[PDB]
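re: that complex we talked abt at group meeting.

here r the seqs, copy pasted straight from the sheet so there may be weird spacing, ignore it
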Amino acid sequence: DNHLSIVTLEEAPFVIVEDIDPLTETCVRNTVPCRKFVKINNSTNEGMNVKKCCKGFCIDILKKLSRTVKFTYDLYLVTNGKHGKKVNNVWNGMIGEVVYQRAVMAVGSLTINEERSEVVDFSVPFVETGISVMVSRGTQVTGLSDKKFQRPHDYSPPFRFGTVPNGSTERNIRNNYPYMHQYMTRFNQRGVEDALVSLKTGKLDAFIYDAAVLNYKAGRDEGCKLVTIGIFATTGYGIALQKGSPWKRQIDLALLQFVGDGEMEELETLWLTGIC
Amino acid sequence: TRLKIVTIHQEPFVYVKPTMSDGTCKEEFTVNGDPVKKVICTGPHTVPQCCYGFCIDLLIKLARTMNFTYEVHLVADGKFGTQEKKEWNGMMGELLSGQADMIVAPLTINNERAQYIEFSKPFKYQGLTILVKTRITGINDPRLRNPSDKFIYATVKQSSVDIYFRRQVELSTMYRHMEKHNYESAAEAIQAVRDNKLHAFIWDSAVLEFEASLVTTGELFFRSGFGIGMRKDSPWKQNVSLSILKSHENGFMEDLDKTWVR
Ligand SMILES: Cc1ncc(CNC(=O)c2cnc(CNS(=O)(=O)c3ccc(F)c(F)c3)c(C)n2)s1
Ligand SMILES: Cc1cc(C)c2c(O)cc(C(=O)O)nc2c1
Ligand SMILES: N[C@@H](CCC(=O)O)C(=O)O
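got the structure back, here u go
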């Protein structure tokens, strides 16, 4: 068969979820269909599949890959977790959707790290990223490896910095800096928007998150006050597949082909542009 | 059971300097008081020479992580590897022919090479920058986008940058101005910028951030990464990538950047 089950996750500007036009019930312009499982109530786990519309940098990467590798897909949004975390030796999120054979591949802002590579096959990285630090203008740290982060109480007053948990960033801090990590838990931010609001209002001195999203958020900050510093643990976004799928060889060739065709900057020239 | 490692002269990734009179290599030190670890690398007459730098340090750490023995030699023809009925030269040809079991060099990952060999996960991420003695925003700056003879810019002729600039249609009018100003080598263009006959030099960022120590301008464009080169039948190459991912995350690649590039 050639119909592929592909999972994704909303994170602008790489995967944006828009509501479907009531009628026409079609995804318009630069859009593909993507279904999201939404529960009816909290009493039971019964729900429905809301077919919506998805666009973004990674979506265009999906369309061109579907065009060059020649395949069809049933794109859907993960509703059990997010990017992927191993909870009690059981992976969830997009990574879990691939490990347990509910999705043959995952496209989105999926960070390539070592621990995920031991259970899924990542493609060639197509978006460079890592762990960056976002602060307001004037705040002075050198990066994640700064000793104001490793030893927060060594400075007065202690810095106030946090991250969005369960992702690759909080995971990396957890194994590299056990003290810094369990100090950040006090300042954990539920979302990326909640994080930057806390920075501008002055309750957070720094925001440690994915470099690709921060560089985009720093690009469109109101008044250009939130800035990134300087990338630690440099890596990239990768299309994850199951261990040993036939498509991994073809996708690496198609992704690498888009580089030689000027198609990769063609999309960054479109989605990742910044005013600041 | 030694690994035949092939590399190429490309600072700051791989420095090569002659041996002393006794056949050894002078013991130098980093900016930090750490000693510089060097390996003997035969190559062009074929005499033993001294290799050290980014890739060498990466080779030493890779050689200890998965525990293998290695013999480093510079590539004979001194090329990286191109498709010239078609056959590879440089380190690409030496890997596929069998003269090398693994390539540890600043080798760009691209589509044509991946159809024959297979890279590891990128141990180094970079792109292209501009080298001027002056402000430039990058590839989208109006002074390169709308070329004039008031601001001259080019690259090395037939280089990896020139080959790609011609390849793109969107850069036609921009590239035509460069084609009339391209130089033979990199050292000629960097001297042209210094002697005020070339106003901008598009080249690899690591080579130009290093040469400035002239200042780089604007954000990087046309990103490209380097991976460990092996044949697709290599049993080790799985953990070769896992070690590259491991060294990125534990901060080892940062220490390499602080020691050589910054
Ligand atoms: C915020 C953004 N960063 C990058 C964007 C667009 N992507 C590219 O330009 C690009 C460049 N090269 C390659 C293949 N070689 S590589 O070693 O794997 C590599 C090198 C540098 C990279 F930056 C990267 F992602 C991957 C690929 C597949 N894509 S957007
Ligand atoms: C660090 C560096 C610098 C230059 C100037 C390179 C180049 O011309 C070609 C190639 C290549 O095709 O691998 N790689 C390079 C790597
Ligand atoms: N991009 C991350 C999620 C956000 C973060 O932790 O920086 C991942 O895929 O794991």
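couple things i noticed - The first strand of chain B starts at residue 3 and ends at 7. The pocket of 2JK (ligand 2) is lined by residues B 10, 13, 80, 106-108, 159-160, 204, 206-207 (CB under 6 Å).
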